[PDB]
């Protein structure tokens, strides 16, 4: 029996994301019109099981958290997906110590990984950011989070 | 009266090196990222450097830049004659809320 | 591919309302922002104001008390710049460029990668 | 051949820490006289390899990062150990979505895991915090970080 | 185990300098902080100031302009509270308690888990 | 004139439930954690509740508390006669930088 497929997620799993050549967005609808760092060709890693795939190769309509389909949020007529995760999402410049902070850096609310997916091989992965602390982009960014509760 | 003071002009022999300086005032450069542009005579400005050291895909490796403290530095290693252009540094200023430019620097191969 | 085309050259009088337009093609109009920079005959680059092609958000230079308005037309994929009460100092080449970044919070980063060839505005008599 | 022992650490490894009944410290010397959340009986987990142990059962003098001994820093005549990690450290209330933020929440510098160890079975694990956003304590706190560069 | 013992009752006059001592045993003195609270005969609890037993940091209440000084003695494992220019209002039972937490940044949390039995100070004639 | 206003006194039948209120002013309880103390007549205050809902190891399960919005609430489910004591709520205030106490509430079994 193979390992748990990357489409299968459980709360408390560790998610590793790489965002190559990520670029800054001034406003992101799935983040409540707040800044984001997003990548054309990001990659997602489940650290516990060692399974991984490119985000653009993932059929986000059939991705499960705790056995339940992922929350879908439609803003601007675009389907966005929400991978919740306990605590804030920590991201840094790839291979270097310089670090970014999310928009709600000063509060107690957590964050979630957002994916825009077109039915097909085109997905964008969105990470909450407060400003251009890592620059305007393109810039390689690595992020780390721990999968959180199934949203209600 | 440019906020980001630059040398008016620099020169080097063909194949030599030039460094272009860009002084700030600690509200401009010390905190924010800096971009570099070059403008050939009678033409549109062109992107050279962004995010204080990053090159767009069409710029060769001769152009390198870095920023330390209140000043940012642009350099060209290998000065071909086709580099007779003005060079500008740009960053945000918080005191005067603007995208201030550098004053310009005309490099001449002579 | 990516291109930005501006209007033609303009000759005006002391006190007028110039409108210069910049049309961009080859990319998603709302994905990026647009800037407006003027350059006098002998002078450097002077930032005038930016626009948000998605939310019509605008910032301006405080050099002009109120004389500048930047407007977008998403359907026509073009931006418009307006100047008012012209004197013999608005005589400059006006550049429209594509914005990458654009934050004004103190770790701010923003550059212009695609430029227009500019429009020459003259204020004479 | 058994798995890589928990004493063995590599840059880019994912570290999972549980801080049971953690309490607030106004000043921590290893953090430059800055607040911390620390636990009597914390547990450390290497997420990639699935090895873990209680911090109090670890001989910190023989813990290696990238094959070299861990950095030691003596303030107030007490030996402190530093486990560097890329980016900031994520910590939150255990089993819940409420999240904490570190002291340098607003800046680009990363964080590290600090352990005070007495030669023997007594170790305290220290996590950077800005204020009592999770309370005064005791409070169950879970943390997550990605092991960073070997300090010079 | 954990205990806090305070000095005996004191009777003073209008204008005086009371010094009440609180000695704590059974735990690391510098691990926690110490608080000082007064309670009038008919009244509630009034926070007077806190000490940081490790680095002698001190915060007070603004109710007194300057009349209160809290001092620690790590070697003797005791804290001292001083009051000055007494009037017929410092008549209260003065409590010393152990502090858990102690931040004053807006998500602030702090409580007192071990209390002293108090010292009665009187201002009469 | 206590900032954290409390009911002066509350009562319930033996074995009934009582609730103690503690109103804030958006600078006290809205942002900061709240602690609860009980003072028996002629004795030292005792810790009951910390961090808005947490009990020290010696307090039984009858006492529970929570904070919502501007006010915080203390309750006792099962009112033994040995609860004739005053109860106080404490939190930090930022406007007047103090550890302000509640005014006190005397619960009587009658």
Chain A residues near residue B54 by CB distance under 8 angstroms: 135, 138-139
Q: What gap in Å lies between CA D97 and CA D92, rounded to an integer?
A: 7
- Say whether residue B31 is in contact with chain A using an 8 A CB cutoff: no
Tell me which residue in B31, B99, B102 faces C107 most closely, judged by beta carbons: B31
- Say whether residue D77 is in contact with chain E using an 8 A CB cutoff: no
Chain D residues near residue E33 by CB distance under 8 angstroms: 26
Q: Residues 75-104, chain C: which have Cβ within 8 Å of B?
A: 95, 97, 100, 104
User: Can you list the domains of chain C with their CATH numbers?
Assistant: 3-123 (2.60.40.10)
Say whether the A–C interface has 3 or more Cβ pairs within 8 Å. yes
D99, D89 in Cβ contact below 8 A? no
Contact D136 E110 (CB under 8 A): yes
- Say whether residue E110 is in contact with chain D using an 8 A CB cutoff: yes
Contact A136 C52 (CB under 8 A): no
User: Where on the phi/psi map is residue F75: left (φ > 0), alpha (ψ -120 to 50), or beta?
Assistant: beta
Chain C residues near residue B35 by CB distance under 8 angstroms: 110-112
What is the chain F residue with the closest CA to D131? Answer: F32
Q: How remote is the C-alpha of A5 from its chain's centroid?
A: 18
Nearest chain D CA: its distance from F46 CA (Å): 17
- The shares of helix, strand and coil residues in chain C, as percent rounded to the nearest 5, are 0, 55, 45
Q: What gap in Å lies between CA D54 and CA A15, rounded to an integer?
A: 24
- Say whether residue B31 is in contact with chain C using an 8 A CB cutoff: yes
Q: What is the DSSP string of D136-150?
A: SS-EEEEEEEEE-PP
What is the chain B residue with the closest CA to C59? Answer: B98
What is the chain D residue with the closest CA to A15? Answer: D14
* Among A136, A137, A141, the residue to mutate for chain C (most C Cβ within 10 A): A136
Q: What is the DSSP string of D36-92?
A: EEEESS-EEEETTTTEEEEGGGS-GGG-EETTEEPEEEEETTEEEEEEEEEEEEEEE
- Say whether residue C113 is in contact with chain A using an 8 A CB cutoff: no
**Residue F84 DSSP SS3:** coil
Q: Residue B102: phi, psi to the nearest 5?
A: -70, 165
Q: Is the peptide bond before F81 cis (omega within 30 degrees of 0)?
A: no
- Say whether residue D22 is in contact with chain F using an 8 A CB cutoff: no
Q: What gap in Å lies between CA E4 and CA E71, rounded to an integer?
A: 16
Q: How remote is the C-alpha of E124 from its chain's centroid?
A: 22
CA nearest to F51, candidates F33, F65, F68: F33
CA nearest to B72, candidates B108, B40, B106, B25: B25
* Among B31, B32, B33, the residue to mutate for chain A (most A Cβ within 10 A): B33
A82, A70 in Cβ contact below 8 A? yes
Q: What gap in Å lies between CA B23 and CA F105, rounded to an integer?
A: 65
Tell me which residue in D14, D101, D148 faces A88 most closely, judged by beta carbons: D101
How many residues does the structure list for chain A? 152
Q: Residue C98: phi, psi to the nearest 5?
A: -85, 140
Return the HEC string of E23-81.
Answer: EEECCCHHHCEEEEEEECCCCCCEEEEEECCCCCCEEECCCCCCCEEEEEECCCCEEEE
* Among A86, A110, A130, the residue to mutate for chain D (most D Cβ within 10 A): A86
Cβ-in-10-Å burial (0-12, 13-18, 19+) of B110 comes to: exposed
Interface A–D counts its CB contacts (< 8 A) at: 98
Around Cβ D63, how many Cβ atoms within 10 Å?
19
What does the angle CA E87 – CA E89 – CA E94 come to, to the nearest 5 degrees? 110
Structure tokens at A70: 């992922």
- Say whether residue B7 is in contact with chain C using an 8 A CB cutoff: no
CA nearest to D110, candidates E45, A142, C3, F8: A142
Structure tokens at D44: 């450390």
- Say whether residue E105 is in contact with chain F using an 8 A CB cutoff: no
D29, D39 in Cβ contact below 8 A? no
Distances (CA, A) of E67 to D5, D145, E70: 59, 48, 10
Chain D residues near residue A90 by CB distance under 8 angstroms: 87-90, 144-146
Interface D–F counts its CB contacts (< 8 A) at: 13
Q: Residue E6: phi, psi to the nearest 5?
A: -110, 165
Say whether the B–D interface has 3 or more Cβ pairs within 8 Å. no
Chain E residues near residue F46 by CB distance under 8 angstroms: 115
Q: How remote is the C-alpha of A109 from its chain's centroid?
A: 16
What is the chain E residue with the closest CA to D35? Answer: E103
Q: What gap in Å lies between CA E31 and CA C95, rounded to an integer?
A: 64
- Say whether residue C58 is in contact with chain A using an 8 A CB cutoff: no
* Among B54, B57, B91, the residue to mutate for chain A (most A Cβ within 10 A): B54
What's the CA dihedral at B42, B22, A135, D130 to 10 degrees? -160
The residues, ordered by sequence, that sit 6+ positions from E104 with a Cβ below 8 Å of its Cβ are E59, F92, F97
Tell me which residue in A87, A99, A100 faces D99 most closely, judged by beta carbons: A87
- Say whether residue E102 is in contact with chain D using an 8 A CB cutoff: yes
User: Can you list the domains of chain B with their CATH numbers?
Assistant: 9-108 (2.60.40.10)
Nearest chain C CA: its distance from A148 CA (Å): 30
Nearest chain D CA: its distance from F33 CA (Å): 7
E39, E93 in Cβ contact below 8 A? yes
Cβ-in-10-Å burial (0-12, 13-18, 19+) of D127 comes to: buried
Chains that touch D (3 or more CB pairs under 8 A): A, E, F
Method used to determine the 3D structure: cryo-EM
Chains that touch F (3 or more CB pairs under 8 A): D, E
Cβ-in-10-Å burial (0-12, 13-18, 19+) of F37 comes to: buried
- Say whether residue D35 is in contact with chain A using an 8 A CB cutoff: no
The residues, ordered by sequence, that sit 6+ positions from B70 with a Cβ below 8 Å of its Cβ are B23, B24, B25, B26, B29, B30
CA nearest to C80, candidates C108, C119, C107: C119
Q: Residues 13-52, chain E: which have Cβ within 8 Å of F?
A: 35, 37, 44-47, 50
C5, C23 in Cβ contact below 8 A? yes
């Amino acid at each position: 029996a193979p390992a748990r497929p990357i489409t299968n997620w459980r709360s408390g799993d560790v998610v590793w994301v790489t965002l190559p050549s990520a670029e800054y967005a001034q406003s992101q609808s799935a983040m409540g019109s707040h800044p984001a760092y997003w990548s054309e060709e990001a990659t997602i890693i489940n650290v516990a099981t060692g399974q991984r795939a490119a985000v653009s190769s993932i059929k986000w309509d059939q991705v499960t958290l705790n056995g339940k389909a992922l929350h879908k949020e439609t803003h601007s007529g675009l389907v966005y997906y929400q991978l919740p995760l306990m605590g804030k999402i920590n991201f840094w410049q790839q291979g270097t110590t310089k670090a970014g902070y999310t928009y709600n850096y000063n509060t107690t609310d957590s964050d979630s990984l957002w994916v825009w997916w077109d039915g097909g091989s085109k997905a964008y992965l969105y990470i909450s950011t407060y400003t251009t602390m890592l620059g305007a982009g393109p810039v390689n960014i690595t992020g780390l989070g721990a999968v959180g509760p199934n949203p209600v | 009266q440019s906020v980001l003071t630059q040398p008016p002009s620099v020169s080097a022999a063909p194949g030599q090196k030039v460094t272009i300086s860009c002084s700030g005032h600690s509200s401009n450069i010390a905190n924010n990222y800096v971009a570099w542009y070059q403008q050939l005579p009678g033409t549109a400005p062109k992107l050279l450097i962004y995010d204080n050291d990053k090159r767009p895909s069409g710029i060769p490796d001769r152009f390198s830049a870095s920023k330390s403290g209140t000043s940012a530095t642009l350099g060209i290693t290998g000065l071909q004659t086709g580099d007779e252009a003005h060079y500008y540094c740009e960053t945000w200023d918080s005191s005067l809320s603007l995208w201030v430019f550098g004053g310009g620097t005309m490099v001449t191969v002579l | 591919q990516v291109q930005i085309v501006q209007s033609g050259a303009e000759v005006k009088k002391p006190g007028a309302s110039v409108k210069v337009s910049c049309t961009a093609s080859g990319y998603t109009f709302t994905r990026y922002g647009l800037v407006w920079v003027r350059q006098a005959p002998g002078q450097g680059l002077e930032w005038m104001g930016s626009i948000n092609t998605g939310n019509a958000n605008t910032i301006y230079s405080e050099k002009f008390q109120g004389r500048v308005s930047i407007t977008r037309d998403t359907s026509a994929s073009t931006t418009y710049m307006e100047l008012r009460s012209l004197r013999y100092e608005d005589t400059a080449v006006y550049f429209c460029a594509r914005e990458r970044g654009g934050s004004v919070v103190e770790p701010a980063a923003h550059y212009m990668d695609v430029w227009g060839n500019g429009t020459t505005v003259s204020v004479t008599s």
